[PDB]
Amino acid sequence: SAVPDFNADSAYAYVANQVAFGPRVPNTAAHKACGDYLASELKRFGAKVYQQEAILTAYDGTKLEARNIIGSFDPENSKRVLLFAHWDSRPYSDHDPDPSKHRTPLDGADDGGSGVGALLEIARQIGQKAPGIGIDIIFFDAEDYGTPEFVTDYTPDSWCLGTQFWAKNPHVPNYTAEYGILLDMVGGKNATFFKEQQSLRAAAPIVEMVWSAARDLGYGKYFINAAGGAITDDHQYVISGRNIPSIDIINYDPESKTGFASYWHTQKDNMENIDRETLKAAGQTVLEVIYNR
Ligand SMILES: [Zn+2]
């Protein structure tokens, strides 16, 4: 139609390809190899790719060799939409039931892999058929290296470090877009995306447009027509730092102890939860919106 077909098999394979490297922990070989892969994949689609490298400081003082990866399509268009996700994997499994796993990196299949894999498939479609507005795909680094449950000292703003850096130092001067859409944990079987509070406060028309498109397409069992909780995530820093109204599409459970999927920040954030039908619902909705709303 006006709108390309999101190939969920393809998105799933992009998730699997990330996970295959090993956990994408900043400073590791797996992180460097996966980042190189992500950059090359955006370039093959025809994006103008920027690799923003910066040394960021984690809550414990670790210097992180961070790399935000930006792919820009129709780069001279002043009218743009930002689509983003984090690509790092957490170095801890600090919600794992087994204390011997708390200090072990997780695969981050849903928490990292899913949003990036959905965006890779979206970007693949954009490369084949221009939507008529500029699109920037951003994979933000060092999102999930915040203070773990077993550390008692507090550090403000310890999450979303790559986004914090970019928002202050964008890849092009005074970068702006009409709106932003973050995908985070968009791969889990039977995921439920509620209207997140920061998204509504900053960008209710964007929320409404996306949730209505999802309903039009038949994905209302995923895009729940209800208010969710407030979630700390990369979009808050895009809102505060670049003044781009942005939303978060994220699996939320209003009755979970953490608000997240059962496997969040555990060793079970692995490929077994990833589901083509969930990826399809998220990805096709985003295509509908950027091409056709
Ligand atoms: Zn996480």
CA distance 214 to 217: 5
Is residue 111 a known part of a binding site?
yes
The residue segments making up the domain with residue 234 are: 1-293
**Residue 291: CB partners within 8 Å, gap ≥ 6?**
2, 3, 4, 131, 132
CA of 250 to the centre of ligand 1 (A): 11
- The letter for the amino acid at 184 is D
**CA 126 / ligand 1 centre spacing (Å):** 28
Amino acid at 92: Y
Q: What distance in angstroms lies between residue 76's CA and the mean position of ligand 1's atoms?
A: 34
State in Å: Cα 273 to ligand 1 middle: 15
- Say how many Å lie between the CA of residue 187 and the centre of ligand 1: 14
Question: Is 153 annotated as a binding-site member?
Answer: no
- Taking the centre of ligand 1 as the mean of its atom positions, its distance from the CA of residue 243, in whole angstroms, is 24
CA-CA distance, 149 to 95, in Å (whole number)?
A: 7
Question: What b/e sequence results for 199-224 when a residue is b if at least 16 CB atoms lie within 10 Å of its CB, and e otherwise?
Answer: bbebbeebbebbbbbbeebebeebbb
CA triple 129-178-253, angle to 5 deg: 90
Method: X-ray
Q: Measured in angstroms, how far is the CA atom of residue 215 from the centroid of ligand 1? A: 28
Count of the separate structural domains present in the chain: 1
Quick check: 131 and 290 in contact, CB under 8 A?
yes
Specify whether the CB–CB gap between 218 and 260 falls below 8 A.
no
In this structure, how many other beta carbons lie within 10 angstroms of the beta carbon of residue 30?
17
One-letter amino acid at 39 equals A
**Ligand 1 center–CA 156 separation, angstroms:** 17
* Residue 150 vs residues 92, 194, 256: alpha-carbon distances, Å: 10, 29, 20
Segment 123-127 long-range contacts (CB within 8 Å, at least 24 positions apart):
123/41, 123/42, 123/45, 123/47, 123/71, 123/73, 124/7, 124/10, 124/45, 125/4, 125/5, 125/6, 125/287, 126/4, 126/45, 126/73, 127/44, 127/45, 127/46, 127/47, 127/73
Ligand 1 centroid distance, CA of 285 (Å): 23
Closest of 131, 108, 137 to residue 44, by C-alpha: 137
**Distances, alpha carbon 41 to alpha carbons 6, 84, 91, in Å:** 16, 15, 25
Q: What is the CATH number of the domain that holds 262?
A: 3.40.630.10
Burial class of 140 by CB neighbour count within 10 A (0 to 12, 13 to 18, 19+): buried
The annotation status of 144 as a binding-site residue, yes or no, is yes
